[PDB]
Amino acid sequence: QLHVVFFPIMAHGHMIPTLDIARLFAARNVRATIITTPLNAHTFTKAITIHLELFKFPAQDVGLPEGCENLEQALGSSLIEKFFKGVGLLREQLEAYLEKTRPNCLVADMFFPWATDSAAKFNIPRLVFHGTSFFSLCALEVVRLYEPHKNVSSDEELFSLPLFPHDIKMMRLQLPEDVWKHEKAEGKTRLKLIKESELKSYGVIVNSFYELEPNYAEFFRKELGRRAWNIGPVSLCNREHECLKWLNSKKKNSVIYICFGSTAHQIAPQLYEIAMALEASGQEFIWVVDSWLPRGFEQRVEGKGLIIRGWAPQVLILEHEAIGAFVTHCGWNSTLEGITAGVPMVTWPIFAEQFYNEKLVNQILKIGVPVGANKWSRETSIEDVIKKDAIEKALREIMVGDEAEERRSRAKKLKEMAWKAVEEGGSSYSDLSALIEELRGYH
Ligand SMILES: O=c1ccn([C@@H]2O[C@H](COP(=O)(O)OP(=O)(O)O[C@H]3O[C@H](CO)[C@@H](O)[C@H](O)[C@H]3F)[C@@H](O)[C@H]2O)c(=O)[nH]1
Ligand SMILES: O=c1c(O)c(-c2ccc(O)cc2)oc2cc(O)cc(O)c12
Ligand SMILES: [K+]
């Protein structure tokens, strides 16, 4: 019986798909163990036999609050750099656990480049998992290597991405200031080691499907030389609420869903602009979130608009017939869920690799419309708030704009292809079989 150990970073966006991968492996009669920390254990226990191993996270040692065991909670350069020091200090526990258990494979988070050598100490192959699209993997590497943002003179000047079979235009504002304004050696070295681990390790597991982005599934393997397996969307593996009853009464494709993911850190002025745009648009909506609402808002929109304050059942909402569009930050799990539900998206990237995912959705898949956000940053400065008019424009365009029906038709195709990829005989099913067979024969 093969044993594969999974080691995601403590971020919801990596933890949930890593659990889905562990489940996909477990369904093939592979023993799957997931490493996490105490304050994150519930996330897996609730979601779940896949075994959990708890490591101690040295928060105090790196100057974090004891309760800061997840990446979303480390807001700001100081806290973020401390968090990465902290996770780097898990290496001793990882190596002790590997020596003790001797698994056949380690699937480790992109943020752990050192995991490669930790596994090599015991002749164990290591796979990298990023939780993002082939397109983002390729675009980030081409930007890192060719630095096409050096050839510009203004924040808004458009440059093309080198080498790609599509002409993808981007601007400096869409890149972290740490890369183009005031170089911090720390982030740059971090990114270098991450991208290098893709070639130094045994290979890369990708939560995507070949038919979704074939040019980039190929580019990653050919022009960039990585060994990769596409096994996603991994969430389809394992496959009421008051808002769903609320939706049952409504016209097909008539409601807009708005949600900014797990890393959502949104300020009151921004929410205020969103509220005004939603009211002015006349569109029915489910919005996942006085000081941030127009007075009388929730009563004025009753029956047409719903604000969800807690966790929303995002997949169940997107797959409800009444939901016709998705305003998203273009985190890859949300983007994939929109694709699998066949729901067109208004793209609102914030940080990380979300601006690359936005390019994939709008220019290549052609299933979305941009809201107009073009500034990369962890937190929103009040001077960068996206205004009511842009938001209303996007809300109208995604429902009744030019090519809106075409976007709906294209997304329906991708929905079909996604389900086909994961069923027996599909490309993702097949690549998972291929990967597991390769792991079973490793010497
Ligand atoms: O109210 C809610 C809110 C969310 N969810 C679910 O949480 C998931 C969100 O993952 P997503 O990629 O969109 O957000 P996030 O964790 O911020 O992205 C980081 O992780 C991503 C993956 O690596 C990365 O692409 C991105 O750049 C990072 F910022 C997604 O599966 C939703 O369905 C829900 O069910 N109910
Ligand atoms: O792929 C990526 C990714 O998954 C994550 C991520 C970041 C924060 C989270 O909370 C969860 C995930 O960030 C990234 C940052 C990059 O510069 C490049 C990437 O490719 C990713
Ligand atoms: K090359």
Numbering used by the authors: 7 to 54, 64 to 254, 270 to 319, 331 to 484
The authors write:
PaGT3, a uridine diphosphate glycosyltransferase (UGT) from Phytolacca americana, is known for its ability to glycosylate capsaicinoids and other phenolic compounds. PaGT3 adopts a GT-B-fold structure that is highly conserved among UGTs. The larger acceptor-binding pocket in PaGT3 allows the enzyme to bind a range of compounds, while the flexibility of the longer loops possibly plays a role in accommodating the acceptors in the binding pocket according to their shape and size.
Compared with the apo-PaGT3 structure, the loop Gly78–Gly91 shifts towards the acceptor-binding pocket in the kaempferol-bound structure. As PaGT3 glycosylates kaempferol to form kaempferol 3-O-glucoside as the major product, the binding orientation of kaempferol in molecule B is likely to be a close representation of the Michaelis complex that forms the major product. The binding of kaempferol in PaGT3 protomers in the asymmetric unit is an indication that sugar-acceptor molecules can bind in different orientations in the acceptor-binding pocket. On the other hand, the binding of kaempferol is assisted by a network of hydrogen bonds provided by water molecules, which could be due to the smaller size of kaempferol compared with the size of the acceptor-binding pocket.
